[PDB]
Design a binder for this molecule. Structure first.
Ligand code: GTP
Ligand code: ACP
Ligand code: GDP
Ligand code: MG
Lengths: 421, 70, 430, 317
């Protein structure tokens, strides 16, 4: 078997992580008690995310981490709270106060070893571990600081495995603390070096989707998390169901990442919204549209290095192939010519939910617009050394901020270099 | 002519055996040099990660110094 | 007494192997349990116990695909030791298949192969089936070929290589794996039959009216062509000519060992019409680009060899008349250093089709094996795709990360450049 | 949208064609080795025809027909005339030629024909091209003292001479064969004339257009350009391109082809047109560049990629 160890850290990481498990548990016919009550053959690759326990129960191979019990107490009480392994809940009492330094260096360093003990236990019970997937935000303190700390420690212990993350980028439109650009820049510096593939889930894009198009005056985190779970379900489809394209984390990485640092994907989904709601050519045009991207970037402002499209539900494969060829050729300028056949397509018979949907995973050079936005916000504060005392007070030095800013600016210039190639 | 008949068959043996010999040595050299390269890539990766831990210990210590001189 | 061991590597090699052995069983009246009520020439491919067991080995670095063989209709056909699986696949990476994961399973494979060789009174050689694009198909195969040249020095090694096609491609790095495997295997392969998935795909869409062909559709058509090529080894007759005799004519230079295969007729099982199809009709189809296993233009390529392998109701008189008509009417140009003649072989055993298949049952069929410089177009397409990516070093880090060096990339590419030049030189007049 | 590549900067004809495509607003020019093109204005030698039409969804067209050099190279044209079933017995318009190899090889057949002509007192002047002589011993030695394959063609000793001046000339006709194989003869031709009087002993030795040539023919011979020369030219072009049609047709190929040819003719004193050579990459006359290049854009390019009376479509009867 090819197992994935899932880790969720912090408020955001645990909230989106809990939704991801509710969504895929439904898709795989697993109820909150861990028992199977589905049809088809769900179950063929259930071991990728689920352990088999006594009494034919399927237990999510998930590790729940946080420096505050609050969000953890919410999970364990909500739906699918009793599905998780109680031993895998690892929490502290003194939170992180939305401070990266606290999560990465002080508060988090005190809790990290006990998390690694659970990671190790879950790994030792793997026939063949493919790697890990971490759900977290980059704007807070636990998911951002302690999450990147966990990634670093796991990589040291498992350097030959794939490290995948679903990283929620911060936005002023959906913010809680002014120091989010500091936390995000510091985390991106870590992700650039220690992850093989990152799904950039932008809160700015999720907000604009809920507000413009969806027409939600005041979107809540629940409204944003609906988009995330629909995306997370989609981008993980090839890993959970029998398929040929990107069947595992390594094959996905080999197809999606041409350059080690340029591993930040721009997800897409179609059609937009469920949360109480109601053709192949229509699915294709939407999933490629800027308005359906989960990262606030205009793909027409850059070029696609690689793309992975996934269609779900019963539909004409001939029509899918025609439509995918039509989006390319009509927009051939937005796909790098030096990477032949860089758009791959997969189709899954089992739909999410909906009768038929589409999910887009793209490695576009336009992703630099996300890193530019953060870099601009980081510089506006760092220039005036605003709130630095909260980070320097934890042991950090200003030089560390200058290095993270510089590494992210280098990342942007690298994405621009390949856009001009 | 018998002399040449023996030189032909011995030449064929010497060439096939020498080909089998070279291929064996080049394959073992490739698998060995590959092992060295892959292990070096992992060693440098871990060295970078270790330098990061040494820096975290130095940050925790740098806080310990500021708290006492407060 | 000349046995032939088949080795099926990776998903493509295994799935194609399943189709070939299913066909061979139908052709020889062998049931899925190995029993053969009719019961020799077929002993080149099958050992006896009254169970007839394929002289084949199935290898894959991942168990799903071979596990289907282990639990499928033909589970009883093979001996468990012939089906070898690992735990972790090569992730479409030549370096993982050849080095990282290949090293871990190679010795076990060579042992299982040795067990088959030990049951041979006069082993003729091996037939290796694999894809160019997969990590196992490309990487592990070249490692296997390297080791086989050591352990079996003289023995012949033929290939059936699945050439990558975007319509069914599963990896962006298939061009890399293709050049790397071709380079490494070149000295160790005596003859290789490339099967362009795009060509088989287009034949299925045109001749069989299949909107979106699947691997099952492709593999059943591939198995027919493979069957025609190996028919001379599994049957015998006065007009049957052995494949190694064709191979002497097919390979003028060690490096130029890639014959183009063309097959006829490919008729839909429902749109059969009941037409018989003369010897003259199918022979003419061999020169229609629409029926080739590799996409290229033989009209603009010089021939170094041409072999015709007939399978059903065929008598020499008809063959000679059909060849006479084809001459002085077709763009058949030979190199000035080769006799402009056709080597013909006839097997009176008519072609077999899988019951409930897409192919119609015919009274006669022909497979042409020709060594034409036109096949170099397939190398040009692959080498160009390699050049586009390699210029930017895209994806190279995945290979370097597994211990490979940029040097192997340029060394393999330089060898491909030399191969393209060799095909150019062999076409120039003396 | 439509994109095109230019892989031959030396081609004067397709440099003007490139400018015309860029003027429309419908065409964008990509870099030399960009494989995601619609039209390819390829190179003269070693054009990558195998890589064409394989990128999925793209409609690709090339300015050359793969093959065609079998009609353009001197030795291959001689081979085609003598061996094609469509030409071997019917060809009365190609001067008696023999392919001579210096280092297959019709040397013995040339000497038999040369000896037949000197015995009967017939004209025995021959021209060797990769030397004009009536000796054959010095003609053969000329070939052997060069590392190239030459062709010994019968020299036209009685050509049609232009008056005044009493001078030799040859006709160049431009033929455009589009995809689907429609042969178009460009209305305007050129006469590459000599500016020295013709001599039948001195072996040691300027663009007239069809209006001036038509005016010379009546009054000079009281006959028009057509019915005496233009019908012969059209017949030769039709026969030549259709003999190679099955070997070069792109109907069963993933890409489409088109080509501009340069047919070279020589008229004898009995007003008989003789084909001398065919050019795969011809050069146009300065004043005919604008009209010819526009015709290539409309007939061959705009027919495949859509956004008068100057090209006669050659058909049989
Ligand atoms: N005709 C045909 N092509 C196949 C088949 N399976 C895979 N392919 C082709 O083979 C290439 C991929 O190689 P695979 O055989 O899937 O890979 P593998 O050898 O298992 O290698 P890894 O999975 O990377 O360990 C692509 O070009 C596929 O289109 C099959 O059953 N038939
Ligand atoms: N048989 C012949 N009779 C008369 N003039 C001839 C001739 N062959 C060639 N010429 C002249 O010599 C010139 C040589 O031109 P070039 O060397 O480009 O080839 P060509 O058109 O003569 C080729 P071919 O070998 O088919 O005759 C011609 O343009 C023509 O004026
Ligand atoms: N999409 C989404 N964003 C969230 C959620 N919870 C918090 N955030 C974002 O996460 C950041 C705050 O960090 P958080 O994860 O709450 O705290 P931590 O425990 O310190 O990691 C901000 O950018 C918030 O917008 C959630 O459930 N969904
Ligand atoms: Mg496989």
């Amino acid at each position: 078997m090819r197992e994935i160890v899932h880790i969720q850290a912090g408020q955001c990481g645990n909230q989106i992580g809990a939704k991801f498990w509710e969504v895929i548990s439904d898709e795989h016919g697993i109820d909150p008690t861990g028992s199977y009550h589905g049809d088809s053959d769900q179950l063929e690759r259930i071991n990728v995310y689920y352990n088999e326990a006594t009494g034919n129960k399927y237990v999510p191979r998930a590790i729940l981490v946080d420096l505050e019990p609050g969000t953890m107490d919410s999970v364990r009480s909500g739906p699918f709270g009793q599905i998780f392994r109680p031993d895998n809940f690892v929490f502290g009492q003194s939170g992180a106060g939305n401070n990266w330094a606290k999560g990465h260096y002080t508060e988090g360093a005190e809790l990290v070893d006990s998390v690694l003990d659970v990671v190790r236990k879950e790994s030792e019970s793997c026939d063949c571990l493919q790697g890990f997937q971490l759900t977290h935000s980059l704007g807070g303190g636990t998911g951002s600081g302690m999450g990147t700390l966990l990634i670093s420690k796991i990589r040291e212990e498992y350097p030959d495995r794939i490290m995948n993350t679903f990283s929620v980028m911060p936005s002023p439109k959906v913010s809680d603390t002014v120091v989010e650009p500091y936390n995000a820049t510091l985390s991106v510096h870590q992700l650039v070096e220690n992850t093989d593939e990152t799904y950039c889930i932008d809160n700015e894009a999720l907000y604009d989707i809920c507000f413009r198009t969806l027409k939600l005056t005041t979107p809540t985190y629940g409204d944003l998390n609906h988009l995330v779970s629909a995306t997370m379900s989609g981008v993980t489809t090839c890993l959970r169901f029998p398929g040929q394209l990107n069947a595992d984390l390594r094959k996905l990485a080999v197809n999606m990442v041409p350059f080690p640092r340029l591993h930040f994907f721009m997800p897409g989904f179609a059609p937009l919204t469920s949360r109480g709601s109601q053709t192949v050519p229509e699915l294709t045009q939407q999933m490629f549209d800027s308005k359906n991207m989960m990262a606030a970037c205009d793909p027409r402002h850059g070029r696609y290095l690689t793309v992975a499209a996934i269609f779900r539900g019963r539909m004409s494969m001939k029509e899918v192939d025609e439509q995918m060829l039509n989006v390319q050729n009509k927009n051939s300028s937005y796909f790098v010519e030096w990477i032949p056949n860089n758009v791959k397509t997969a189709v899954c018979d089992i739909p999410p939910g909906l009768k038929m949907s589409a999910t887009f995973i793209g490695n576009s050079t336009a992703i630099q617009e996300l890193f530019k936005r953060i870099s601009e916000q980081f510089t506006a504060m760092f220039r005036r050394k605003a709130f630095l005392h909260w980070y320097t007070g934890e042991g950090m030095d200003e030089m560390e901020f200058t290095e993270a800013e510089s590494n992210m600016n280098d990342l942007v210039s690298e994405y621009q270099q390949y856009q001009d190639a | 002519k018998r002399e040449h008949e023996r030189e032909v068959i011995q030449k064929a043996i010497e060439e096939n055996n020498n080909f089998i010999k070279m291929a064996k040595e080049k394959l073992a050299q490739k698998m060995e040099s590959n092992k060295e390269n892959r292990e070096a890539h992992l060693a440098a990766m871990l060295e970078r990660l270790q330098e990061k831990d040494k820096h975290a210990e130095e940050v925790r210590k740098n806080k310990e110094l500021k708290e006492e001189a407060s | 007494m000349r046995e032939c061991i088949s080795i099926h590597v990776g998903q493509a090699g295994v799935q194609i192997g399943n189709a070939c052995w299913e066909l061979y069983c139908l052709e020889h009246g062998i049931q899925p349990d190995g029993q053969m009520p009719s019961d020799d020439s077929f002993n080149t491919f099958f050992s006896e116990t009254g169970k007839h067991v394929p002289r084949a080995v199935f290898v894959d670095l991942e168990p799903t695909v071979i596990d289907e063989v282990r639990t499928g209709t033909y589970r009883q056909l093979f001996h468990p030791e012939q089906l070898i699986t690992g735990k972790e696949d090569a992730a479409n990476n030549y370096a993982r298949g050849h080095y990282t994961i290949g090293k871990e399973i190679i010795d076990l494979v060579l042992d299982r192969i040795r067990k088959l060789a030990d049951q041979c009174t006069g082993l003729q050689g091996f037939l290796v089936f694999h894809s160019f694009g997969g990590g196992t198909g490309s990487g592990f195969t070249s490692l296997l070929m390297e080791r086989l040249s050591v352990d079996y020095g003289k023995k012949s090694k033929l290939e059936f290589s699945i050439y990558p096609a975007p319509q069914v491609s599963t990896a962006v790095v298939e061009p890399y794996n293709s050049i790397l495997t071709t380079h490494t295997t070149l000295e160790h392969s005596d003859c290789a039959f490339m099967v362009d998935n795009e060509a088989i795909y287009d034949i299925c869409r045109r001749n069989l009216d299949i909107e979106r062909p699947t691997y099952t559709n492709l593999n059943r058509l591939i198995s027919q062509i493979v069957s025609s090529i190996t028919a001379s080894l599994r049957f015998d007759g006065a007009l049957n000519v052995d494949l190694t005799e064709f191979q002497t004519n097919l390979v003028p230079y060690p490096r130029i060992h890639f014959p183009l295969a063309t097959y006829a007729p490919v008729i839909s099982a429902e749109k059969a019409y009941h037409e018989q199809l003369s010897v003259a009709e199918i022979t003419n189809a061999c020169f229609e680009p629409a029926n080739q296993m590799v996409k290229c233009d033989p009209r603009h390529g010089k021939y170094m060899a041409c072999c015709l392998l007939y399978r059903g109701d065929v008598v020499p008189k008809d063959v000679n008349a059909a060849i006479a008509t084809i001459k002085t009417k077709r763009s058949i140009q030979f190199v000035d250093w080769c006799p402009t003649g056709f080597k013909v072989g006839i097997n009176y055993q008519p072609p077999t089709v899988v019951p409930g298949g897409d192919l119609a049952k015919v009274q006669r069929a022909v497979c042409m094996l020709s060594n034409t410089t036109a096949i170099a177009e397939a190398w040009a397409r692959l080498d160009h795709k390699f050049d586009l990516m390699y210029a930017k070093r895209a994806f190279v880090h995945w290979y370097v990360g597994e211990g490979m060096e940029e040097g192997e990339f340029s060394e393999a590419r330089e060898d491909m450049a030399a191969l393209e030049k060799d095909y150019e030189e062999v076409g120039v007049d003396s | 949208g439509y994109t095109f590549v230019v892989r031959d900067e030396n081609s004067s004809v397709y440099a003007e064609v490139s400018r015309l495509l860029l003027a429309t607003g419908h065409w964008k020019r990509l870099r030399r080795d960009n494989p995601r093109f619609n039209l390819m204005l390829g190179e003269r030698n070693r054009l990558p025809f195998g890589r064409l039409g394989h990128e999925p969804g793209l409609v690709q067209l090339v300015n050359y027909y793969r093959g065609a050099d079998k009609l353009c190279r001197k030795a291959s044209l001689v081979k085609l005339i003598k061996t094609s079933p469509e030409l071997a017995e019917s060809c009365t318009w190609f001067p008696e030629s023999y392919v001579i190899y210096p280092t297959t090889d019709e040397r013995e057949f040339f000497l038999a024909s040369y000896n037949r002509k000197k015995e009967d007192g017939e004209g025995n002047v021959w021209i060797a091209k990769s030397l004009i002589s009536s000796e054959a011993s010095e003609l053969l030695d000329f070939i052997d003292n060069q590392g190239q394959v030459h062709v010994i063609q019968k020299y036209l000793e009685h050509p049609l001479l232009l008056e005044p001046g009493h001078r030799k000339f040859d006709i160049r006709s431009w033929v455009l064969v589009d995809h689907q194989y429609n042969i178009y003869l460009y209305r305007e031709g050129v006469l590459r004339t000599a500016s020295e009087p013709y001599h039948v002993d001195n072996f040691q030795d300027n663009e007239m257009f069809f209006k001036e040539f038509n005016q010379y023919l009546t009054s000079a011979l009281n006959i028009t350009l057509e019915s005496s020369i233009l019908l012969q030219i059209k017949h030769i072009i039709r026969n030549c391109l259709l003999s190679v049609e099955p070997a070069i047709s792109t109907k069963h190929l993933p890409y489409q082809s088109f080509q501009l040819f340069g047919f070279d003719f020589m008229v004898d004193e009995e007003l008989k047109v003789w084909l001398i050579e065919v050019n795969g990459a011809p050069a146009c006359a300065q004043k005919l560049y604008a009209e010819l290049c526009q015709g290539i854009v409309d007939i061959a390019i705009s027919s495949v990629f859509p956004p008068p009376a100057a090209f006669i479509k050659l058909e049989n009867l």
